[PDB]
From Swiss-Prot, chain A:
GO terms for molecular function: calcium channel regulator activity; channel regulator activity; ionotropic glutamate receptor binding; voltage-gated calcium channel activity. Keywords: Calcium, Calcium channel, Calcium transport, Glycoprotein, Ion channel, Ion transport, Membrane, Phosphoprotein, Synapse, Synaptosome, Transmembrane, Transmembrane helix, Transport, Voltage-gated channel. GO terms for cellular component: AMPA glutamate receptor complex; cell surface; cerebellar mossy fiber; glutamatergic synapse; hippocampal mossy fiber to CA3 synapse; postsynaptic density membrane; Schaffer collateral - CA1 synapse; somatodendritic compartment. The L-type calcium channel is composed of five subunits: alpha-1, alpha-2/delta, beta and gamma. Interacts with the PDZ domains of DLG4/PSD-95 and DLG1/SAP97. May interact with GOPC. Acts as an auxiliary subunit for AMPA-selective glutamate receptors (AMPARs). Found in a complex with GRIA1, GRIA2, GRIA3, GRIA4, CNIH2, CNIH3, CACNG3, CACNG4, CACNG5, CACNG7 and CACNG8. Interacts with GRIA1 and GRIA2. Interacts with MPP2. The chain crosses the membrane at residues 5-25, 72-92, 102-122, 138-158. This is Voltage-dependent calcium channel gamma-2 subunit. One of its GO terms (biological process) is regulation of AMPA receptor activity. Belongs to the PMP-22/EMP/MP20 family. CACNG subfamily. It is found in: Membrane; Synapse, Synaptosome.
UniProtKB/Swiss-Prot annotation, chain B:
It comes from Rattus norvegicus. It is found in: Cell membrane; Postsynaptic cell membrane; Postsynaptic density membrane. Ionotropic glutamate receptor that functions as a ligand-gated cation channel, gated by L-glutamate and glutamatergic agonists such as alpha-amino-3-hydroxy-5-methyl-4-isoxazolepropionic acid (AMPA), quisqualic acid, and kainic acid. L-glutamate acts as an excitatory neurotransmitter at many synapses in the central nervous system and plays an important role in fast excitatory synaptic transmission. L-glutamate binds at P8, T10, R15. Induction: Down-regulated in the pyramidal cell layer of CA1 in the hippocampus by global ischemia. Changing L13Y: Promotes dimerization. Strongly reduced desensitization. The chain holds residues 492 to 540 of 883 of the full protein. It comes from the Eukaryota. The postsynaptic actions of L-glutamate are mediated by a variety of receptors that are named according to their selective agonists. This receptor binds AMPA (quisqualate) > L-glutamate > kainate. The M4 transmembrane segment mediates tetramerization and is required for cell surface expression. This is Glutamate receptor 2.
Amino acid sequence: RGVQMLLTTVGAFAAFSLMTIAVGTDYWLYSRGVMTHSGLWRTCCLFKGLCKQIDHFPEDTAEYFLRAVRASSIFPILSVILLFMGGLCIAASEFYKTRHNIILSAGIFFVSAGLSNIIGIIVYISANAYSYGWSFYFGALSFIIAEMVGVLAVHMFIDRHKQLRATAR
Amino acid sequence: KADIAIAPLTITLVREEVIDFSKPFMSLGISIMIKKPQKSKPGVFSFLD
């Protein structure tokens, strides 16, 4: 009951924290002309210690559109905004739960935000072309925890709907 | 100033009016210079290729 709600809340908090860490730095790593880390905004080489914005999208029209989507990583930023809105909706539905239908819309928005995060991860993997940074693994694990938290949230929603159908009958 | 010229000099009509020429040992023409075709990214067309 309430323990599952608190677990869903701390899972959403950990997923938002790992998403912020994935947005921040160390998203990908590749040896440039020594090794160099990148966080989808700027690159930092192994002189040594300097950093520069190497996210230059210029040097069919589908390649230019894919470069425009890969420019500045618009889709995971929109996914993070949708995850923040879903977390705010879950925090609003946690206390003073008057309406029994905003939880399903919040869960649907959370699952769609996870799907958009997976789509943006596919775009950022397609924008790479030898290893990968820690924040890609952190975003993948946050996607796993967000999917599990969405399953737990819709399980609590169908349990509440079954309780409402039992109380109405 | 010179005696004989051995160089790729184009045999033209306006140069025939002042000096002479031999038969063309090497014939040629105007060609097209393009790059070698490397592997380009096929992309979204690969699903129904």
